[PDB]
Symmetry: D2
Subunit: 242 residues, 4 copies
C-alpha cells in the first residue's frame, strides 16, 4: 500500500531505460504521474507511456540534456508547464562516462563526468526546490528528492572510475547539506545506492532493475518514509555493508 | 504490493507494545502470521490477536524472557510448534535498562544491558537460523532477519548510556558478520535504526507509525530481496550517515 | 620529537608481547615510564624492563587477569601505588578467544570474548578515569586513553569472529560515549585499529608491530595530538579505507 | 624520531600561510626540502625560507594558480627543476571560495569551488605521480600524498557551503580510488581533516600548531609506512566517526 502516491507528480531524469524506467512503472502501479526523460528521444515514446498507463498511472516524455544547466531549467519548466508542479524529484541521470587511469585524466574527462554526475544533480534539484516547497504546503505533508548514488561513493570505485566514485560521494554529502537547508520546507532527501546492476557480492550476482525500483517507491511515499531523510539505502547484495 | 507477505511466519520479539506491536499490525495487513512476545503477560492478549486479525492476518502471543538463552531456545521451539516454521525473525526487544555514568558502572549493570541488547539478539538469531534456512529452501526466495538498531550505535548515545550505545554498535556490526556466514543460505539481514529535539532537523520525534513501514520493506523478498547488511536510519535527519 | 612524553606514566594492558610490547619500547625511547602487564608472568620480566630502560626509559611489570573487574581494580591500584598516577591508559588486551559459526555459539563463548574485549576495556578505563582526570589538572594539558580496535569493528570480521568483530565495534562506539562524558576533564580518547598483523590488502602483506607502535606514540603525546579526540586510525595497509 | 624526513622533497600547495606554512615549518624541523606555494606572491618570501632554514631544513617558493591545470603541471615541473624530484606531495590548497544557498548557485560558483577543491587536487596529484613513483623505487620505502580534507565531507558542512562540503567528500573518496591504483607503486595516500563552538567537545577551535604534527606523521615512512587510505580527523571531537 503506497496509495498516497496516486496522482503524485514525479519527475525522473534519465528514465527511458534501466533503473529509471523500471522505477517509473512501479510508481505508475500506484497511479503516479511520471515525467520520463532523456537527453535523446526514445525510439518509441508512446510505447513507454503506454506501459505507464497500462500499469495503472500516467505521464509524459521530456527530452533534455541535463549536463547543461539551461536544459535542467528548461526541463523543470516543461514538466511544471504540463502538470502544475512537482511532488517528487528523482535524480537518476548519471553514469561512468568513461574509465581512465589518473595519469591519462585530462580536463575534458573531469568535466564530462562531473557534469553528468555533479552539476546536473545540483541544478536539477535547485530548479525543482521552488515547486517541491510549494507542493509540500499544499499537500500538508512532505515533498521528496531521491537521488541515485553508488557503492562507489563509499569505497572509491573500480580503477578508472575515480572521478565517478568521487562524484557520487559528492552527492551523498551534498544531500546532507540539503537536509540542513530544506527540512524546514518539509522536503525530504534520500538516496538509493545501487552497487552494480560476482562473488565479492555475498549473493553472488548482479542486481536486476526490478530489485532497485521498490526502494525508490519507498522513499517516494510520505506515508512509508515520511520521518526518514538524509539516509542512503544500499541495494547491492551485501557487496558493502556500511 | 507486499503480497508475498501472505502467510509469512514472522516471530517478533518485544512486540506487545511500541514499535513491535505497530510493526506486527502492519505486517498482519498483508496476511502475515505473526508471533508477539514479551517477558510479561500483557493485559489483553486477544485484542492484540484481534488487531492482527482485523488488519488482515493472524498470530499468537508467547511469553518468554530473551535476556536468557534457554528462554530464547524455548520461544523459537514454541513458535515452531504452533506454526511449523519461521520465515522472518525480527529482533526488536532491547532498551536502555537503566542509565549509569562510567564511574558508577558495575558488572551487574553491564550484564543487564548486554544480556538485553547483545545475548538476546545473538541467541534468538542462532536458534532461528535452521528454520529460516529451511523456509528459503522451500520458498525458492529468501527468508529474513530484521533487528532494531539505534542512532546510538553511530554517535555514541548520551551520557550514562554508553553500554546501550555500544550494544547497538555491536549489533550493527555483528549483522555484517552474519551476512558473510549466511547469505549462502538465502537469509537476509537488515536493521532499522530508530533515532531518539532541536538537533532533529524535522523539529520532532518519530512515531511507531512512521517506523513500521521500514520493517515491512525489509520483511518482503519482492521489495528488498537484493538488500542485505544495511541499516535504514529512521530519525528526521537527526544523524545523516 | 615527542619530548613531552618524558616521565609520562603509561599503563598498557596486554603488553608483554606483540603490539603491546613494541609500543612499550617506542614510548620508552622518549623516556616514558611504562607499566607492562599480562594475565600470566613472562618467562623473563627483568629482560623486558631491561629493554625499556635500554631504549631510554623505565617501567614495572604488573600481572593481572583483566577479564575480571576485581583484577582491573587491583591492576590500576598497583600501578598507581608504584608510580603516583596515570598519564595515559592504553587498552591493548583483547583478541579473538576462538572462532565459532553462529550455530555453535553457546553462552561461554559469548562470555569469554566479551570479557576479554568488552568488560575489560570498560572497567580498566573506569578505574583509571579518576587518576587520569587528576593527572590532567596537574599537567595543565591533557590525559589520554588509547584503545586497540580492529578493522573488524567496521566490516564484521571473518566467519567465526562475529562476536569479536561486534565487541570491537562496541569499543569504537563506547569511546564516542566517553568523549561526551569526559572531554571536560581534558581526557582524550583515541583508537588504533590494526587490521591484521594478503592481496585483499593493497600493500600485499600483513603489518609488523613496528608499523603499529608509532600511531600509539602519536595519540599518547599531547603536543602531537592534543586537539584530536574520538578518532580511529586504521593501520591496515589499505585493507579498509573508511 | 622522524629522521627519515631528512632531505625529503615535499611540495606543499597553499603553503605561504595557515596550516600549510605551519606544516612546512614542522617538516623543515626534520631536514625536509619543502616547496611553498600560492597563487599570490607573499610579502616576505625569504622570511619563509628563513623559518624553514631556522627550523632545520631548506626550501623554495613557487607562485602558481592551481585552480588551473596548466599551472599545476608547471608547478610540478618547476619544483622538479629545482630539487630533481618529489618524495611527498601535500594537497593543502582549498577553501570555501564564497558561500551560496542552493537557489542562488550558478555555474560560475560551482566552477569556482570545484576548480579550487577538486580539479586542483586531481591535477597536482596526476602530475606528481611519476615523480613519486620514482622516489619510492629509489628509496626502497614509500613516497606519499597527503591532502587536507574537512569535517564537511562527513556531515554536509553548513548552509551555503554545500559545494565545498561535497568537494571534500569527493576528495575523501577519490583518495580511496588512488589507493587501489597506486599502492603497487608504493605511494601512500592519507588525509588530515580539520574541523571548523558549543558543538565542539573541547569547547574551542584548532590551531595550525595542533594540525601540523598529523601531516608529519603521514609524511614519514617510519611512522606511517603501513598506513594508507585513511582520514585523521583533527577537530576537538566535533565529529567522532
Ligand atoms: N524510541 C527510542 O527512543 C529508541 C531509540 C533507539 C533505539 N530504540 C530501540 O527500539 C526497540 C523497541 O523499543 P519499543 O518501541 O518496543 O519501546 P518499548 O518501551 O515498548 O519496549 C518494551 C517492549 O519490549 C518488550 N520487552 C522488554 N523486555 C523484554 C524481554 N526481556 N523479553 C521480551 N520482551 C521484552 C516489552 O514487553 C514491550 O513489548 C529497542 O530495541 C530499543 O533499543 C528505541
Ligand atoms: N580552518 C578551517 O576552518 C577549515 C575547515 C575545513 C577544512 N579546511 C581546509 O584547510 C585547508 C587550508 O586552509 P588554510 O589553513 O591554508 O587557511 P588559509 O586562509 O591560509 O588558505 C589560504 C592559503 O592557501 C593559499 N591559496 C589560496 N588559493 C590558492 C591557489 N589558487 N593556488 C595556490 N595557493 C592558494 C593562500 O596563498 C594561503 O597560503 C583548505 O583545503 C581548507 O579547505 C579548513
Amino acid at each position: 500500500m503506497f496509495s498516497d502516491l496516486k496522482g503524485k507528480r514525479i519527475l525522473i531524469t534519465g528514465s527511458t531505460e534501466g533503473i529509471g524506467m523500471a522505477t517509473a512503472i512501479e510508481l505508475a502501479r500506484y497511479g503516479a504521474v511520471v515525467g520520463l526523460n532523456s537527453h535523446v528521444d526514445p525510439a518509441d515514446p508512446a510505447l513507454l507511456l503506454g506501459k505507464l498507463r497500462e500499469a495503472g498511472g500516467d505521464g509524459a516524455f521530456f527530452r533534455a540534456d541535463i549536463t547543461k544547466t539551461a536544459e535542467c531549467q528548461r526541463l523543470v519548466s516543461a514538466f511544471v508547464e504540463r502538470f502544475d508542479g512537482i511532488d517528487v524529484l528523482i535524480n537518476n541521470a548519471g553514469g561512468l562516462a568513461g574509465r581512465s587511469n589518473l595519469e591519462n585524466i585530462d580536463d575534458a574527462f573531469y568535466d564530462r563526468v562531473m557534469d553528468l554526475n555533479g552539476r546536473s544533480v545540483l541544478m536539477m534539484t535547485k530548479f525543482a526546490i521552488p515547486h517541491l516547497r510549494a507542493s509540500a504546503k499544499a499537500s500538508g505533508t512532505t515533498s521528496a528528492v531521491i537521488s541515485t548514488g553508488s557503492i562507489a561513493a563509499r569505497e572509491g570505485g573500480g580503477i578508472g572510475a575515480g572521478v565517478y566514485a568521487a562524484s557520487k560521494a559528492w552527492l551523498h554529502d551534498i544531500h546532507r547539506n540539503w537536509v540542513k537547508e530544506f527540512t524546514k520546507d518539509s522536503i525530504r532527501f534520500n538516496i538509493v545506492a545501487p552497487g552494480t546492476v560476482a562473488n565479492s557480492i555475498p549473493m553472488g550476482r548482479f542486481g536486476t532493475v526490478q530489485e532497485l525500483a521498490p526502494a525508490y517507491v519507498f522513499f517516494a511515499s510520505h506515508a512509508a518514509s515520511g520521518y526518514i531523510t538524509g539516509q542512503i539505502l544500499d541495494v547491492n547484495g551485501g557487496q558493502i555493508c556500511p
